[PDB]
């Protein structure tokens, strides 16, 4: 018996090398820990959250510190179109001088990394102008991380650990998060936007030495108190306004122009300040709905338990749902896995929204012209979102294993979807099969037509519904005079009101065929959207099937007694490999990775063809699969794989090396994924024979060498597949874009 891990007596008795690996992958599962009460669980999670926020603040502080010490922020604000932002400096002692020269730009005296995270554009759009500003922000975030660390340590002290009834307070928390984490924080961000960001955008310097001096508006808090609020939307920035300079400047602080600043090709800062103000007011209002200890307010529990039956006082949009939502509040509030899998689904939808919105409506100055930054940011957030959506269903399964109560949830919506789960799974299966057969067969027909010298015989189906939705927003690209495309329509004019003051600015941007806001779509878009539909449907099939069959199926009726992750149930009953619910999240990680590959491949090729000017490359080349293979993967690889050749090294040498590194890790995954445990256990037995019988080999394993377990090697191979899949595509996307468009 070792003393490690201290959270599990059964792993301390483990005499093998399995306990080291199982103590690393069961360390944060506090529920299944020795002597864990619910209160102690919540308190530990609270302190862990504080340490996590400290890590986030330390990370942001380090980014700020390395741009302020080793970047070129002050040199880049002078020309943010012809200067590459610098992340930090290289100190690899193993470089030859040919790599030291390759990673040194024209305006630098040391090897550096080019920044592709977009923080230069973000910091330039919010007022930060000097390295001293960046250093001050970094030191503030260092101290704020220290504050979060002290808070986390403090709430582990006996007089300061919150009670369980405090953690169960779902009415006070929603009020304080809606009004005070989303409202007051957004109100403070509007305050910064009108005090620092918009002034510094016009050329005036506002700091913590003259902000009490400088008023944000010529009539300081005169229009707001008097009630004439339209004065703040008067004299905006003119079209010929040059960012960070006063030429073309205005005086307005809250205006609603719509569209983009024509010089930075980004959203207007007056629009973003007005946005965050109208968001702050609505969220501060919304954080006044539930009662805490002042009598007024709602009770969430009484609202949910009131959706039981029929009638207008009952759940009338689905009266045949039995007990309706009775027990759903307690399923949410008592189960931390229900909350986590619910919040992960919400966050994974919001992260995809972030990715889908920040390329179409760029919010930062000159970030639409940083092509590699735009591509990296979209791909980053879409992969983060796919992982969050995968973990949403993971913890939906873990809730149904660990916290689901079939009697507290008797005949409600949750127990009503668990009843007919075969209908849900078979209909996801039907949608998946239909989409897959049709999309693959259309692509293969197009391949066989183009290969046999008939590109004209391809089946090219236009996305007429999405082209029409492009038209209902005011796109005149097609011959569809729909709602906002029709200039004297009920939607365009706002007949009684005539207050859509967003319409001319928004139609200046959607009709502008040079931004990414509602890109033109054709036949090659319809097929890849159906492929994305297939991918999301099959990933949902795997995850929904494994969550709904988590508690048991016909092949293993008592699957809830074996846990969430377990290898199998042996080779009986035909064999039960990958039968656990954890293995569904395992099997759907491949499909998430494949779907996000399709998504990001589509986005990247669409934009590479747009940015090069040769949009017909993607147009008449994405309808068949060899065009994807040859005009995207083969073609935009020539600069990456020539990062180092027998003639020299350019600055793409690390991207070529990481491309090969990701290929290596992805291949190593297949070793854990195809070869299984007994092969390696017999190999390790021969190795144990060899070691005990060799002279001069005085070491001996304290813990017995065993092969990695079944679930362990599934996780190890999946982690390898993921890491190599991310590394290969991250190296290709940064180098295929940063070389064509330096």
């Amino acid at each position: 018996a070792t003393k490690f891990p201290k959270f599990s007596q059964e792993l301390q008795q483990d005499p093998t090398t399995r306990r080291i690996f199982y103590s690393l992958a069961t360390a944060h599962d506090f529920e299944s820990h020795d002597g864990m009460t619910e209160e102690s669980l919540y308190q530990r999670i609270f302190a862990s959250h504080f340490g996590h926020l400290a890590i986030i603040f330390l990370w942001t502080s380090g980014i700020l510190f390395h741009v302020a010490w080793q970047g070129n922020f002050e040199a880049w604000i002078k020309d943010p179109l012809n200067i590459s932002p610098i992340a930090h400096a290289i100190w690899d002692p193993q470089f030859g001088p040919a790599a030291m020269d390759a990673f040194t730009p024209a305006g630098a005296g040391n090897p550096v990394n080019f920044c592709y995270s977009g923080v230069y554009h973000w910091w330039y759009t919010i007022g930060l102008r000097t390295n001293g500003d960046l250093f001050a922000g970094a030191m503030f975030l260092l101290l704020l991380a220290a504050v979060m660390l002290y808070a986390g340590w403090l709430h582990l002290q006996p007089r300061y650990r919150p009670s369980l009834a405090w953690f169960k307070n779902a009415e006070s928390r929603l009020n304080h998060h809606l009004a005070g984490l989303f409202g007051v924080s957004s109100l403070a961000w509007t305050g910064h936007l009108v005090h620092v960001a918009i002034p510094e955008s016009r050329g005036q310097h506002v700091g913590w030495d003259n902000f009490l001096s400088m008023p944000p508006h010529p009539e300081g808090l005169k229009p707001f108190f008097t009630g004439n609020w339209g004065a703040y939307a008067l004299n905006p920035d003119t079209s010929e306004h040059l960012f960070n300079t006063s030429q073309g400047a205005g005086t307005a602080i809250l205006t609603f122009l719509g569209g983009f600043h024509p010089q930075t090709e980004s959203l207007w800062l007056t629009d973003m300040a007005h946005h965050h103000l109208a968001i702050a007011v609505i969220f501060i209002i919304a954080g006044h709905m539930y009662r805490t200890n002042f009598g007024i307010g709602h009770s969430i529990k009484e609202m949910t338990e009131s959706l039981q039956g029929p009638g207008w006082t009952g759940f009338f949009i689905a009266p045949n749902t039995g007990r309706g939502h009775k027990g759903i509040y307690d399923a949410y509030n008592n189960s931390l896995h229900f909350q986590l899998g619910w919040h992960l689904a919400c966050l994974g939808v919001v992260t995809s929204l972030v990715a889908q919105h920040m390329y179409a409506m760029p919010p930062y100055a000159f970030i639409a012209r940083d092509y590699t930054t735009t591509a990296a940011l979209y791909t980053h957030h879409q992969y983060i979102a796919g992982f969050l959506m995968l973990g949403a269903f993971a913890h939906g399964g873990i809730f149904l294993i660990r916290d689901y109560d079939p009697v507290a949830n008797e005949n409600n919506v949750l127990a009503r979807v668990l009843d007919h789960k075969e209908a849900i799974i078979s209909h996801l299966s039907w949608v998946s099969l239909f989409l897959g057969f049709h999309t693959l067969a259309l692509y293969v027909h197009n391949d066989c037509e183009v290969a046999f010298g008939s590109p004209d015989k391809q089946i090219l189906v236009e996305p007429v519904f999405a082209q029409w939705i492009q038209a209902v927003h005011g796109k005149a690209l097609y011959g569809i005079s729909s709602l906002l495309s029709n200039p004297d329509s009920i939607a365009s004019t706002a007949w009684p009101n005539h207050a859509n003051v967003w319409l001319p600015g928004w139609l200046e941007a959607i009709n502008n065929g040079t931004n990414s806001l509602f890109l033109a779509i054709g036949p090659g878009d319809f097929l890849v959207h159906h492929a994305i539909a297939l991918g999301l449907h099959v990933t949902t099939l795997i995850l929904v099937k494994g969550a709904l069959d988590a508690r048991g199926s016909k092949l293993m009726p008592d699957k809830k007694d074996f846990g969430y992750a377990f290898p199998c149930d042996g080779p009986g009953r035909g064999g039960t490999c990958d039968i656990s619910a954890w293995d569904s999240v395992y099997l759907a990680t491949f499909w998430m990775l494949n779907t996000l590959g399709w998504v990001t491949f589509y986005w990247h090729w669409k934009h590479l063809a747009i940015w090069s000017g040769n949009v017909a490359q993607f147009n008449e080349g994405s309808t068949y699969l060899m065009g994807w293979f040859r005009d995207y993967l083969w073609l935009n690889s020539a600069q990456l794989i020539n990062g180092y050749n027998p003639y020299g090294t350019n600055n793409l040498a690390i991207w070529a090396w990481i491309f090969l590194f990701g290929h290596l890790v992805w291949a190593i995954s297949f070793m854990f994924l195809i070869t299984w445990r007994g092969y390696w256990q017999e190999l390790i037995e021969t190795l144990m024979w060899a070691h005990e019988n060799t002279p001069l080999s005085f070491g001996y394993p304290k813990d017995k060498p065993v092969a990695l377990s079944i679930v362990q090697a599934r996780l190890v191979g999946l982690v390898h597949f993921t890491v190599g899949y991310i590394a290969t595509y991250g190296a290709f996307l940064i180098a295929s874009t940063g070389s064509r468009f330096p």
Binding site: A1, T2, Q12, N110, D703
Partner: protein, 42 residues
């Protein structure tokens, strides 16, 4: 031009010593400390 590693930034002698410490001087002590922590007996 660049015959060796340089720093055109403040306290550019700090990578020179920080990269050895973080990457090949302090790691094997940390590995030894963690190994002694996971192999200590009750």
């Amino acid at each position: 031009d660049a015959t060796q590693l340089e720093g055109a930034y403040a306290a550019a002698w700090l990578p020179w010593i920080m990269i050895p410490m973080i990457t090949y001087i302090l790691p094997f002590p940390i590995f030894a400390i963690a190994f002694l922590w996971i192999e200590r007996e009750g």
